[PDB]
Design a protein around this nucleic acid. Structure first.
Ligand SMILES: [Mg+2]
Ligand SMILES: [Mg+2]
Ligand SMILES: [Mg+2]
Ligand SMILES: [Mg+2]
Ligand SMILES: [Mg+2]
Ligand SMILES: [Mg+2]
Ligand SMILES: [Mg+2]
Ligand SMILES: [Mg+2]
Ligand SMILES: [Mg+2]
Ligand SMILES: [Mg+2]
Ligand SMILES: [Mg+2]
Ligand SMILES: [Mg+2]
Ligand SMILES: [Mg+2]
Ligand SMILES: [Mg+2]
Ligand SMILES: [Mg+2]
Ligand SMILES: [Mg+2]
Ligand SMILES: [Mg+2]
Ligand SMILES: [Mg+2]
Ligand SMILES: [Mg+2]
Ligand SMILES: [Mg+2]
Ligand SMILES: [Mg+2]
Ligand SMILES: [Mg+2]
Ligand SMILES: [Mg+2]
Ligand SMILES: [Mg+2]
Ligand SMILES: [Mg+2]
Ligand SMILES: [Mg+2]
Ligand SMILES: [Mg+2]
Ligand SMILES: [Mg+2]
Ligand SMILES: [Mg+2]
Ligand SMILES: [Mg+2]
Ligand SMILES: [Mg+2]
Ligand SMILES: [Mg+2]
Ligand SMILES: [Mg+2]
Ligand SMILES: [Mg+2]
Ligand SMILES: [Mg+2]
Ligand SMILES: [Mg+2]
Ligand SMILES: [Mg+2]
Ligand SMILES: [Mg+2]
Ligand SMILES: [Mg+2]
Ligand SMILES: [Mg+2]
Ligand SMILES: [Mg+2]
Ligand SMILES: [Mg+2]
Ligand SMILES: [Mg+2]
Ligand SMILES: [Mg+2]
Ligand SMILES: [Mg+2]
Ligand SMILES: [Mg+2]
Ligand SMILES: [Mg+2]
Ligand SMILES: [Mg+2]
Ligand SMILES: [Mg+2]
Ligand SMILES: [Mg+2]
Ligand SMILES: [Mg+2]
Ligand SMILES: [Mg+2]
Ligand SMILES: [Mg+2]
Ligand SMILES: [Mg+2]
Ligand SMILES: [Mg+2]
Ligand SMILES: [Mg+2]
Ligand SMILES: [Mg+2]
Ligand SMILES: [Mg+2]
Ligand SMILES: [Mg+2]
Ligand SMILES: [Mg+2]
Ligand SMILES: [Mg+2]
Ligand SMILES: [Mg+2]
Ligand SMILES: [Mg+2]
Ligand SMILES: [Mg+2]
Ligand SMILES: [Mg+2]
Ligand SMILES: [Mg+2]
Ligand SMILES: [Mg+2]
Ligand SMILES: [Mg+2]
Ligand SMILES: [Mg+2]
Ligand SMILES: [Mg+2]
Ligand SMILES: [Mg+2]
Ligand SMILES: [Mg+2]
Ligand SMILES: [Mg+2]
Ligand SMILES: [Mg+2]
Ligand SMILES: [Mg+2]
Ligand SMILES: [Mg+2]
Ligand SMILES: [Mg+2]
Ligand SMILES: [Mg+2]
Ligand SMILES: [Mg+2]
Ligand SMILES: [Mg+2]
Ligand SMILES: [Mg+2]
Ligand SMILES: [Mg+2]
Ligand SMILES: [Mg+2]
Ligand SMILES: [Mg+2]
Ligand SMILES: [Mg+2]
Ligand SMILES: [Mg+2]
Ligand SMILES: [Mg+2]
Ligand SMILES: [Mg+2]
Length: 394
RNA sequence: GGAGGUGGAGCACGAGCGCACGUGUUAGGACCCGAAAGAUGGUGAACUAUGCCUGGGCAGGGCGAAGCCAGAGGAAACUCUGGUGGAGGUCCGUAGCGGUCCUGACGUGCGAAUCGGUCGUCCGACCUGGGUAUAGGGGCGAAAGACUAAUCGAACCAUCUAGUAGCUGGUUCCCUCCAAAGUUUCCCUCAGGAUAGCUGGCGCUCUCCGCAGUUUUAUCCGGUAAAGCGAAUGAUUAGAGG
RNA sequence: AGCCUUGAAGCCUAGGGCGCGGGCCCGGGUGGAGCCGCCGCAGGUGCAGAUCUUGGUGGUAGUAGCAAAUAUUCAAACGAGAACUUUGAAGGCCGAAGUGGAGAAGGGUUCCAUGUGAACAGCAGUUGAACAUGGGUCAGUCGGUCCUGAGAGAUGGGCGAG
RNA sequence: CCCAUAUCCGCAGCAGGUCUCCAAGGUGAACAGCCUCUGGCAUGUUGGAACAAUGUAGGUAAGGGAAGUCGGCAAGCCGG
RNA sequence: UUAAUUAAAACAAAGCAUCGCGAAGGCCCGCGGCGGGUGUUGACGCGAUGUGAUUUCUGCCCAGUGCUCUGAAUGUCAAAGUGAAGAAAUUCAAUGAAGCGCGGGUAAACGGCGGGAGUAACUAUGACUCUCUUAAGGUAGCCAAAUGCCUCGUCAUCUAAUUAGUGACGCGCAUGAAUGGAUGAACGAGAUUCCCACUGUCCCUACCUACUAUCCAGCGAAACCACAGCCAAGGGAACGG
RNA sequence: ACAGUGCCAGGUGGGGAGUUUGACUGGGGCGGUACACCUGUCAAACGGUAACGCAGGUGUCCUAAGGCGAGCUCAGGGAGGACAGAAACCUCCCGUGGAGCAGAAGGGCAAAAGCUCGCUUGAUCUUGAUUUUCAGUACGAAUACAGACCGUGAAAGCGGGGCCUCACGAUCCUUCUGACCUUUUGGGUUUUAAGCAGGAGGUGUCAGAAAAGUUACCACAGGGAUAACUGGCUUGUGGCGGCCAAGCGUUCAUAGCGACGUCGCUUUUUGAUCCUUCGAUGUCGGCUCUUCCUAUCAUUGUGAAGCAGAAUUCACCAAGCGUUGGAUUGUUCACCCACUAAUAGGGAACGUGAGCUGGGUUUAGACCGUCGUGAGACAGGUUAGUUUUACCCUACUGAUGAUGUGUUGUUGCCAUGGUAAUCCUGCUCAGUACGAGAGGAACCGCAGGUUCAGACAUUUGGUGUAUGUGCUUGGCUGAGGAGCCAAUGGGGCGAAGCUACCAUCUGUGGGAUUAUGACUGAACGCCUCUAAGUCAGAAUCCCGCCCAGGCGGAACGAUAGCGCCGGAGCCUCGGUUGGCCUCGGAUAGCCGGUCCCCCGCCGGGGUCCGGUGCGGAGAGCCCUUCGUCCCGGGAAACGGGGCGGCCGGAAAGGGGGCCGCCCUCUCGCCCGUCACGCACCGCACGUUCGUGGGGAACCUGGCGCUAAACCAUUCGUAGACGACCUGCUUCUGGGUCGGGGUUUCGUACGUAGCAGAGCAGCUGCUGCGAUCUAUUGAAAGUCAGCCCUCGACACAAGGGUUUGU
């Protein structure tokens, strides 16, 4: 018989199966559709979730209750040291879909990238690309590369660059770089290859990919949470306290007929560590990394037009469980998937951004840099010392 | 003794007895296993029920009965106030005894009734050891058909006894031939029998005229289909002429 | 005038065959002492079942489980072997209505010494209330013994087939 | 000799049952509970490593305060 | 108090009221007797019942069924005895124990305790009247009560809203007087309603601890099993592995 | 002389014993009797034929209503006759039975079978046969006779009951009647008793026991032959929907409704039935959770109104998304309160008890009412009443993994499967359109929210055994200090982590189209959204975005006794027995040339000419194999065979053609001349693709390569275990300790104090004293999963198992 009172089902069947992701680094499932009339540009990037904070800005929203007024907004800090292009991969459109046509690699590949090619770097002899790299040094090999580059011009329709991160500049334990294809959108196929060929072994800073006030998508793997029951995995109603044999369950997992449990019924199992794509996360700031100019370390990348204090984005005591952000970073509005240190794929939007929220221009008045390791109450150590005064340590 | 009818499991020139084999029906344990029951004679009150005999046991508190002392009041009766006193099938509560709820634990348990918290009572119609008495259509019951050795709306043990079962289950090698019925009547008959029918087997009396789930030719029988209702019975519409 | 220690019955056999079949024959192996053909006689004479009887074995399955009562750690000794035995030292618990010291009923040698580590003690054990070989309970005065208790129970007598 | 979370009865070294005697300090009304001395024991028929779900047993919870449920069941408040 | 699903409103109880009995007796046991229990007793006792403290009250009915009392006045009435017929067996008559019939008593014995119509100067009711009628025709009380079908009765109160609760009403299917009626302090691990307080019961879930589960070494069962084990429809012993 | 006892006799005697307490039956019970009979019908023209089928009857009645004879004629009607009339009695006429014959009905009957008289007892005695039911038994009833006695009639005759079809009863026992009856046991007489034959006493459950209840304290043997669920057939009832059109709607049938009638659909109602299940399918409701239907309440896109606007009603495509919080009740159902866009209706074994709960129903205790003598009963109330098992298979959820790609790794494609966003409010439009007024919109834009989904912890909150740091109770270590125990002693605050619409962030684009509105346009000289053709078109659908990623591919790196190129054989697996190396397409039209003309980066259009049952044909084309020899003739000579280079190929990429070479042949093809070869004596598996695929090996030359994976260790971005993410010598690495930062609590011990309420002792001093001030934002902790050090210390160049085209 029909269920007495209507109610929406718990959870979305569009995110099934609720299993551990097969990839740790978020995969770009769909790159932006190429527009041949735009200049050659890259469409994605890799960053690492440093941590969260909040900022003060004045909203510019005509007809809104917060028009001309200051608001406090949470933001996620993603460290984005420049990537290094090391290879090109070309694709051919076939009636069975894009097929990898040809891959070319640069002559020199840093050991961070090579670590990606091994399961035990300690035990290996580091022989990767030791014989390929010779193709760039002899006339017979060189004449074979430009033919490979010429073939990719005749036949390939999609061009991507194999860029990798620079793990030596991060505060992390890992030394193995994250390597990913990035589609080269823009001009003709020939213009894509000349642009990509010129940038082999070169560095591509995040600013060259993304801009201020741009809406982007973050792709990553959520925080794993292990085996979970239906109450926590699916958010079903807890049964009454009197229930015998447990109340953190779904009471009826199906009807007599069909004589099977259906795929649409909440069950226990893995929670978290799911691949997810989130869209429309606005870029609030592309902060510049530390520079040594005239013997001085310039690090006031957390200063604003309305706050001239020389402080970095790092909070007192550093980003908890992450470290210190000393490279370029992207300040995203809101929260993103993953743990601290999680590698996050930054991708340009697949949509046309014509909305007041999407077009709004961000102007920061303040960036909170108090300690997150507790209830921090000082923005800077200079401010803390001036308030507290001398201590017994002094 | 005769004549003529009628009842008999008769005579009318024997066919029986003895033995053996088969089949069928029965009486017996009765093809095998299966009741709930009933009867006789015995063993149990080490559990529990109840009476009796002789022993043991039950913190700390609350309330504050009668009696008594003092002070005040009063003409008397007596009254008021403060103490003392320590009653009670009295109250909170431990040991003990019990077992309300969680409808908790457990539910192939630690346990064939237990465990946790929470609970009832806790000087009495109180709790308990041992001795002793009541024994099965009997006991004992502050009464629930309770208890009477994990057994109780009649214990347990052996025998009668292989109790009876129109009811359930089973019923053991091969080939060959033939091959049903669920219908009639009677039955406290309706899940069963007896009875006729349907089957099989053994033959025997003949044969190389008789018979037939058939037609033909003759000849009867019938009251359904249809038809009729300006024909009987019954029902029924409309005008018309007297 | 059957077969048989020059190998009976039984049992096994990707051996050769026979018969529509019930079955049977022969070859090979194992076995070690009896057995079969034909004419008759006799029967406690043929199994797939009966929640059949008795015995054996599976999958489940190296699975459920070995979770009630706060708790162990260090060093050494013996030893083939040590989370579990002994000693020493720590840290804990029962907390005088005890996890202390003694009895009644019941048990019946479980008591004590030495030995074993087969089986048992639902892991292990160098240990045990297990197994083995030997010991151990001393009374005028502590109980029984005697008294009578509720009660049981002869004789006389009565009843009674007994 | 045991006299009982192992010498007895429950098939067993069974969280059950089974009659008694003696009875320290502190707190406290107290043979209550909590800690300790005398005496006793080795966590109750095993250990190691983890710290998922679901349990069993304990706790805490903003704002509301029975709207839950057959029912305030459960817990909670009160407490000398 | 139902050991082991019911702890209760059930049982008991003091109180109350009946009933039998003066011992060669009442009540009871026993196969049996100069047998036995009450009874080491004696009506302020023993035996058999009902109700269930106190308070207040306990109405009418003896026709029915019981129980009980009186009996030669006296219908029926066994054996035995008496008389007559007959050869006797036998038959017939007369007589007439208890018990039944007959007549009283008795309900704190089992139990029971009506129907129809008309009627007051608006309407409604109908104190009043008529009538049929039984052994009485339900009195004092009480009630949609643990008792009322219709029924979630009607009115009021309690809520925003109440098949719940409480107070009223009462032609009450089918209330009612020791088959006890009405009450009422204290008491209840008894049933029910509301309120304050409290709170994770809930909105709406989260986190933490211990023991498991978990993995490992050792050790290690049991239930159950035709063969088994992916579905849709079909047909089919009318829902197929 | 009674109590008393022994033995008989009568009464009483559920205290106790034994036993019974029918059958049929759309379950049983209650109700009926279809249980023994009879008539009509069913019944299908012999007979027979069932149902709790239909319409009825029977357990009697008759001294005549039996028997005979005779004589008459009935119901009804018409017409006449004093009282007399509708109806009394008399008369005449008609009268086929329309009357009567005991009764139910059917049949039969007119000088009779009816009515009336006269005489009577054939309703008597007796043996057989027969018919009906049937078994060819009994009874009952009936039919023909036969033998006696009779009645009646003049007689023929008729009659042994009723005009025919019903009206009834075994054995045993009792009673009566009959005989010059038999027996009555050793004989005789006599009473008695028993026999034989015929009646009666009765069994209606009628082929014939002698028979009351209750069980909820219940029991056994069974039954799915049989009820209480689901399911199945059916669909009366319930629900929903059409058709006709009398009316309603002021007018007007059909905007919206719709009588009298009628046709359907559904199985979310109840029935009917009894097919499955009684060696058990857990029986109401709620809770929880998913899914599906549409008969659509809301929302999107629409059509019609008795649509001015607003509001509403009818209808279409339509199930994408929603459809709520509560008081009373066990409730389903209902009723109300409140909010809402709306508060639609249903299925899934009346979804869902090894998912729960157990309020109700439905055991055992107990109360009330009614009923019963009672035990007891009650779709009447009330209260208390044990909810068992998963470790098996599958399904499902997650986790390792498996084939096979030579091994291994990085980066990737996507076949397939899933899939998602949703509704409302405010502002503006606008007090505008519309409207007399009242009232009163909409599209575009802007700002928010609801429901849902996916995350996340900067902030606020929650937790907190960091057992971090204070406070604090009882006890314990002689005290101080420092601590511990009280199953987390209690409590304040609290890091990290986890976590809350209880904080924060984010949630998207196309295509074909449905309904509908249209274009052009015939059919059908007009018209027409339709017939051919064409356009716009949506919470629908499909795709995208997003989640997974195949016994599915790809590119690229590195490849340890192994890779590449260049002899005999041996095993094993099979199949096969020439090749076609390509326009695009139309089919009411095609193909090939022609370029002479027009365009274009040699190709397109035109013209012109040829073919078209395609012959520049798949009905086709190419290749064709017996070999060699001698010498001729045609054909080649621009020729055949054999090492270096350049154009060219990517959807799954060419051992094609062409330029050189140094060579090598004038033989290859056709027709002839000339002979030869194992000619194996008629015969199968012959004849290739075939140096086929795969596997071991054995060689024998050249050119080349010297890896990873897994374990172990470590990490914590991960986690039940596996798995997953990481590190393991660049004078560099991680580790440990130390230091610094951050952060929590809140100011340490000691020491000093002329601070301290007081008290004690000594003559102002010294003691005891909770607490107070300074030292002292002090002390203590702080990554175990916080940040930075490069200070100290050691360690680190390792170990095991595998893998080859
Ligand atoms: Mg619904
Ligand atoms: Mg429960
Ligand atoms: Mg923080
Ligand atoms: Mg016979
Ligand atoms: Mg026999
Ligand atoms: Mg009997
Ligand atoms: Mg005793
Ligand atoms: Mg008391
Ligand atoms: Mg008390
Ligand atoms: Mg329980
Ligand atoms: Mg369990
Ligand atoms: Mg007593
Ligand atoms: Mg007795
Ligand atoms: Mg009873
Ligand atoms: Mg037998
Ligand atoms: Mg037997
Ligand atoms: Mg039978
Ligand atoms: Mg009979
Ligand atoms: Mg049968
Ligand atoms: Mg006929
Ligand atoms: Mg006809
Ligand atoms: Mg074999
Ligand atoms: Mg021998
Ligand atoms: Mg024998
Ligand atoms: Mg067998
Ligand atoms: Mg295990
Ligand atoms: Mg244990
Ligand atoms: Mg002791
Ligand atoms: Mg001792
Ligand atoms: Mg062991
Ligand atoms: Mg010993
Ligand atoms: Mg004696
Ligand atoms: Mg423990
Ligand atoms: Mg231990
Ligand atoms: Mg033990
Ligand atoms: Mg709260
Ligand atoms: Mg609060
Ligand atoms: Mg409520
Ligand atoms: Mg509710
Ligand atoms: Mg409570
Ligand atoms: Mg009980
Ligand atoms: Mg109980
Ligand atoms: Mg009485
Ligand atoms: Mg009275
Ligand atoms: Mg009377
Ligand atoms: Mg009455
Ligand atoms: Mg009254
Ligand atoms: Mg009252
Ligand atoms: Mg009331
Ligand atoms: Mg309420
Ligand atoms: Mg009464
Ligand atoms: Mg193990
Ligand atoms: Mg099956
Ligand atoms: Mg009696
Ligand atoms: Mg009886
Ligand atoms: Mg019957
Ligand atoms: Mg016929
Ligand atoms: Mg005549
Ligand atoms: Mg005659
Ligand atoms: Mg006659
Ligand atoms: Mg004589
Ligand atoms: Mg009962
Ligand atoms: Mg019943
Ligand atoms: Mg059936
Ligand atoms: Mg049904
Ligand atoms: Mg009209
Ligand atoms: Mg049938
Ligand atoms: Mg079954
Ligand atoms: Mg089931
Ligand atoms: Mg079952
Ligand atoms: Mg529709
Ligand atoms: Mg159901
Ligand atoms: Mg189920
Ligand atoms: Mg259940
Ligand atoms: Mg209940
Ligand atoms: Mg009951
Ligand atoms: Mg009565
Ligand atoms: Mg206007
Ligand atoms: Mg927080
Ligand atoms: Mg926190
Ligand atoms: Mg101290
Ligand atoms: Mg303790
Ligand atoms: Mg706190
Ligand atoms: Mg906090
Ligand atoms: Mg159209
Ligand atoms: Mg279109
Ligand atoms: Mg469109
Ligand atoms: Mg071949």
């Amino acid at each position: 018989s029909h269920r007495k009172f209507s109610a929406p089902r718990h959870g979305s069947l569009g995110f099934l199966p609720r299993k551990r992701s097969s990839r740790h680094r978020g995969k770009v499932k769909s790159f932006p559709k190429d527009d041949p009339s735009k200049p050659v540009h890259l469409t994605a990037f890799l960053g690492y979730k440093a941590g969260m904070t909040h900022i003060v800005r004045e909203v510019d929203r005509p007809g809104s209750k917060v028009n001309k007024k200051e608001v406090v907004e949470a933001v996620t800090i993603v460290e984005t040291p420049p990537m290094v292009v090391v290879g090109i991969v070309g694709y051919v459109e076939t009636p069975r879909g894009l097929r990898t046509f040809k891959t070319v690699f640069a002559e020199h590949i840093s050991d961070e990238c090579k670590r990606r090619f091994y399961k035990n770097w300690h035990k290996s002899k580091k022989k990767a690309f030791t014989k390929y790299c010779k193709k760039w040094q002899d006339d017979a090999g060189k004449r074979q590369l430009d033919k490979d580059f010429s073939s990719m011009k005749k036949y390939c329709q999609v061009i991507r660059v194999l860029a990798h991160t620079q793990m030596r500049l991060l505060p992390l334990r890992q030394k193995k770089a994250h390597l990913m294809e990035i589609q080269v959108n823009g001009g003709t196929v020939a213009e894509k290859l000349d642009w990509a060929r010129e940038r082999l072994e070169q560095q591509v800073p995040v600013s060259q990919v993304f801009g201020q006030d741009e809406m982007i998508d973050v792709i990553g793997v959520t925080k794993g949470k292990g085996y979970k029951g239906v109450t926590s995995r699916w958010h079903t109603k807890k049964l009454p306290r009197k229930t015998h044999r447990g109340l953190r369950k779904v009471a009826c997992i199906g009807a007599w007929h069909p004589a099977r449990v259906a795929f649409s019924v909440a069950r226990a199992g893995q929670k978290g560590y799911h691949h997810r794509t989130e869209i429309n996360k606005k870029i609030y700031k592309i902060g510049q990394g530390y520079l040594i100019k005239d013997g001085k370390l310039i690090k006031n990348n957390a200063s604003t037009d309305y706050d001239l204090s020389d402080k970095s984005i790092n909070p007192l005591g550093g980003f908890v469980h992450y470290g210190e952000v000393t490279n370029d970073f992207v300040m995203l509005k809101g929260c993103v998937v993953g743990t601290k240190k999680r590698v996050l794929t930054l991708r340009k939007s697949l949509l046309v951004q014509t909305k007041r929220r999407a077009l709004e221009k961000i102007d920061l008045k303040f960036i909170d840099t108090t300690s997150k390791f507790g209830h921090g109450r000082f923005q800077t150590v200079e401010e803390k010392k001036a308030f507290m005064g001398p201590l017994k340590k002094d």
